[PDB]
Amino acid sequence: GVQGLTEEQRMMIRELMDAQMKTFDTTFSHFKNFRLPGVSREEAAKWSQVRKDLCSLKVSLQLRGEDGSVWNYKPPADSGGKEIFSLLPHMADMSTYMFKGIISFAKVISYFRDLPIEDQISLLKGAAFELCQLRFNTVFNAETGTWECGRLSYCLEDTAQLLLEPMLKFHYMLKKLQLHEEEYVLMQAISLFSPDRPGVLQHRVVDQLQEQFAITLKSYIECNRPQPAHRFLFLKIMAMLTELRSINAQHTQRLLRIQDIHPFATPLMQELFGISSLTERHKILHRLLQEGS
Amino acid sequence: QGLTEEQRMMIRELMDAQMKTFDTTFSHFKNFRLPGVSREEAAKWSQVRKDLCSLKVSLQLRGEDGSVWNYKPPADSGGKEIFSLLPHMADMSTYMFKGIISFAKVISYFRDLPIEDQISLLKGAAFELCQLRFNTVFNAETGTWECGRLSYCLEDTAGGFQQLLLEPMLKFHYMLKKLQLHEEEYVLMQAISLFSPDRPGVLQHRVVDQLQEQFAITLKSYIECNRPQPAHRFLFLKIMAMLTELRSINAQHTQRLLRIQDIHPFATPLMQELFGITSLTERHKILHRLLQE
Amino acid sequence: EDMPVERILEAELAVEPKTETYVEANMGLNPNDPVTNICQAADKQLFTLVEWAKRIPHFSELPLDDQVILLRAGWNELLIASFSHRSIAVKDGILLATGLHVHRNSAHSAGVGAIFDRVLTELVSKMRDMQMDKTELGCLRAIVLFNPDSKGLSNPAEVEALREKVYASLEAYCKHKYPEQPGRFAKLLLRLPALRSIGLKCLEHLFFFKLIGDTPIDTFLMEMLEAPRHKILHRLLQE
Amino acid sequence: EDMPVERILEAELAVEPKTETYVEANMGLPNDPVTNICQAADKQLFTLVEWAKRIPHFSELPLDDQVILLRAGWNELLIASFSHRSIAVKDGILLATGLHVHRNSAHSAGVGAIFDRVLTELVSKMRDMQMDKTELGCLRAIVLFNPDSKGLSNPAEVEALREKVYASLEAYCKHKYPEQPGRFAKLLLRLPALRSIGLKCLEHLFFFKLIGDTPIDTFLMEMLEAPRHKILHRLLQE
Ligand SMILES: CCOP(=O)(OCC)C(=Cc1cc(C(C)(C)C)c(O)c(C(C)(C)C)c1)P(=O)(OCC)OCC
Ligand SMILES: CCOP(=O)(OCC)C(=Cc1cc(C(C)(C)C)c(O)c(C(C)(C)C)c1)P(=O)(OCC)OCC
């Protein structure tokens, strides 16, 4: 494990690292004032689907006070509707905090703010959820199945192996890889600068950027950490960047289904998922992407 | 059975007043606050800590859906935390007392008794009654007060063997729930306690005296009759032991409350009235209001 | 038959003498520091209480530290009831076992007025009105003594048993000796929480005067107001 | 040496013929193609099974392991194969039925965005980097050997086989293309691009299957229905 890449490959890694640290609070300290849960048929097959999405997707919420208190929340099992949208207005507030932490992560990326405004928007829309999951995997724990997010601590609920859910299977598989923080931020650059996303005008620019980040990542693993049992790791990471788009796809259809029935999405969230120029249409994103205060 | 008509018609008047003012489900208990998201002044806090220490409980709160909230209190340290479970307790009191000042107020004997002595009588039995009622919802096996949606579970020092018995307040409930009493027996202890002649301030002492006597023989013979003979022989003795131990538990409580209020003014104006915190109908302005309309 | 109600009476008569003839003939109807005096009678009667306990059957075949626990827990109310039952002989105040007679001026000006008046209206004035017999007194006390809800007992399931035998014996006696008074046995037991509530308000005074320090407190009384080391009590019980 | 990069090429060559001489000479520089695309898909599914059987060690896997892999992978394995054929033509995509589809017959059939996506993301990149066939058979052998597929008797055998492909393609891509140092990576970089397009294709297959006004043949239908698969399960034991 000795190190050594091109100077360009070195500056671009630390460009991400000091963009990650600059915009990602691993303690979620600045995340408060958020919402919390409370203290006509045959189309309903649509409803049956929504409940199916969530019934593998159960979590024990938990708030720690600065004292020693644990305000723990456990989820209601399902026998009906409206009980299921419990954490939904809370999660909607979490993402609004994560996503502007995503928008800012890209906002400070030099390559990113060099792309035109109507291209930054497009890159963020298709990478928002992708970026969220990779950030959440850093704070994910295997032998408890919880996302220790500072004061918040979203746990897991055994039922029978909900690895039958790929979403969960992702976080588990991505975690057994034991990635260095330098690799996480490269997967983010790779995910953020994907040229296939709907709206990417400057295709060649973004395409080149991705490849750069990709080889940088492989070379990182190749000449840093290369305990020769660490081959195939670029493969495993590649397999995860690939799975991250099944997960992205399937959870976008998920979100759509839910909002279809129960509208809860924040004016941000709607812009990030589509719920005429873009800047007129993504005015809150437009403002967040010109913002210097 | 095996009673006098006047005796059985006095149990009936209590069991009436009970269910008419004792909602086992605490359904109308609402808007209650919750623990949110010198050398002498040190000796005070030192003792106040030892009060609340043996009295640590989790606040398992259930919602209509099946979502269970849960509040695990902090661990013992300095500063203001156990004070947090205290505005919740303060509000639980105002609901318990209100249902006590209505249990008495709808009792005929208590109606006839003049206001000033009704005031006096409640003040001496107020806390003593709450425990008698709370024991009806106590579970010795699990160590929680199943107050409907809300539960108050007993924390574990070394869960292997509790010895929370070292706290008299708890041991009372374990001692009492051990006897396995009927609703009639429970409501009879409440009247013996409510109609105690030795409460400070009682003017018409003779009436209350003879009354407590009446409730006593009634309870003495309920056990002689309804319960099997060489089996529940030494009951009433056991119940009398509890009514005696109640005077201690009331004693403990009051000095306890006085000290906590001194270092942390948290008393409902109702609490103040019932526990005398800074003519008798004029001094107790709000307890006056609750009786006679 | 295993707790003879007569054995209880023998104990009461052995440790308490007759009502004094001056009291009988003059006290009734038809400044030296009250508190010090009260604490002096307390210490005096604490030795008496140990002798009384040893005469109450099966008490002395208990584990030694059970006897300590039982006595330490109930000494307060065993002495309050005993002095309350003497005071029915007099018209107005309390008669301590030192012979001293205290008033509701010597108590009011001493700060112990409320407890004083309470003991008058609740213990004395009721032991008198129902004419509390000494055998009943000696049984109520045996009951207060045999408290199995006291912490540390090697076997509460004997203190429970022995309390039950007093309960059965007092019940049989109270039936036998007073048939015309059917609810009498339960009016006696009704005095127990009245005794406790008064019994604790006295320690609430004993501690307040122990803290001021300007109230002389003798050895045995001091040992009782002191958390357990106990030399006196533990010694006496073996003699 | 245990997954010879030549045996992989043998498979690709055995199931894919040379670029047609009309195409090589003239190409490069109706009223529902969707039926034709589906028709091509069903045709290629039989080809796909014969392809995978030639890929080393795939036939020694448990019988229902081969099914799971082919089933999870078929959609992208066909997209890889038709995106590679279509670098031969100047525009649009070339199906194995010979049919040349345009982005007018694709835009007016609803499959506009996805088709153009395959163009600018798969065709336009396999062309510009001059993706050779041995690299295709290897990338496809990778997509095929996906051990993150549910039900696999021994996911660490499929793990091992993808590694041997990864190793062999690594050795080859170095040998054949030295001046292009990060070629092996940009190959793998196409994988998430292939998935995101592949899932958009099933998102279309399932949409046209729902309408019912899109004839779908036995094997393609056996791939779009939940596990079952008798054709697939039969072909593998032959
Ligand atoms: C704390 C970490 O979990 P997590 O970030 O990533 C998934 C593991 C997570 C968050 C999350 C957030 C959103 C919003 C914010 C866009 C609304 C979703 O729409 C979804 C689903 C999956 C329902 C589509 C999930 P979790 O609550 O997802 C719901 C199942 O995860 C809990 C298992
Ligand atoms: C002693 C602790 O036990 P508990 O939890 O349980 C006993 C039943 C409790 C008793 C209690 C009540 C009060 C009120 C009523 C005056 C507020 C107190 O101030 C205190 C302390 C000890 C803080 C002085 C205790 P609960 O009665 O609170 C009710 C308001 O408990 C029920 C939740």
> Whole-angstrom Cα distance, residue B245 to residue C195?
11
Q: What is the CATH number of the domain that holds B26?
A: 1.10.565.10
Chain B: give the shortest CA distance to residue C164, in Å. 7
**Number of domains chain A contains:** 1
**Pocket lined around ligand 2, Cβ cut-off 6 Å:** B 51, 55, 57, 89-90, 92-93, 96, 130-131, 134, 145, 152, 169, 253, 256-257, 260, 271
| Pocket test residue of A24, A158, A167 for ligand 1, highest count of atoms within 8 A of CB | A167
Of how many residues is chain B composed? 293
> Whole-angstrom Cα distance, residue B140 to residue B172?
11
Mind listing the domains of chain D with CATH numbers?
Answer: 1-238 (1.10.565.10)
C177: helix, coil or strand?
helix
CA distances to A88, A241, D97 from A148, rounded to whole Å, are 19, 23, 54
Q: Amino acid letter at D194?
A: L
Asked if A88 reaches chain B (Cβ–Cβ under 8 Å), the answer is: no
**CA–centroid distance, residue A95 to ligand 1 (Å):** 9
Q: Which of D47, A5, C149, A123 is nearest to B179 (CA)?
A: C149
| Pocket test residue of B33, B86, B89, B136 for ligand 2, highest count of atoms within 8 A of CB | B89
What is the full DSSP assignment across D52-107? HHHSTTTTTS-HHHHHHHHHHHHHHHHHHHHHHHTTSSSSSEE-TTSPEE-TTTTT
DSSP single-letter state for residue C94: E
A48 is in an annotated binding site: no
* Inter-axis angle of helices B168-179 and B237-263, nearest 10: 150
Q: Which of A118, A128, A63, A168 is nearest to A265 (CA)?
A: A128
Q: Which of C80, C97, C184 is nearest to C133 (CA)?
A: C184
DSSP single-letter state for residue B231: T
Experimental approach was X-ray
| Domain around B71 | 1-293
List the single residue in C126, C168, C183 with the smallest CB-CB distance to B217: C183
**CA–centroid distance, residue A271 to ligand 2 (Å):** 51
Spell out a b/e string for A233-245, using b for 16 or more CB atoms within 10 Å of the CB, else e. Answer: bbbbbbbbbbbbb
What is the full DSSP assignment across B160-184? TS--GGGSHHHHHHHHHHHH---HH
CA angle B219, B221, B225 (to 5 degrees): 125
Chain C: give the shortest CA distance to residue B143, in Å. 19
A251 is in an annotated binding site: yes
Resolution in A: 2.8
* Contact present, B87 and B79 (Cβ < 8 Å): no
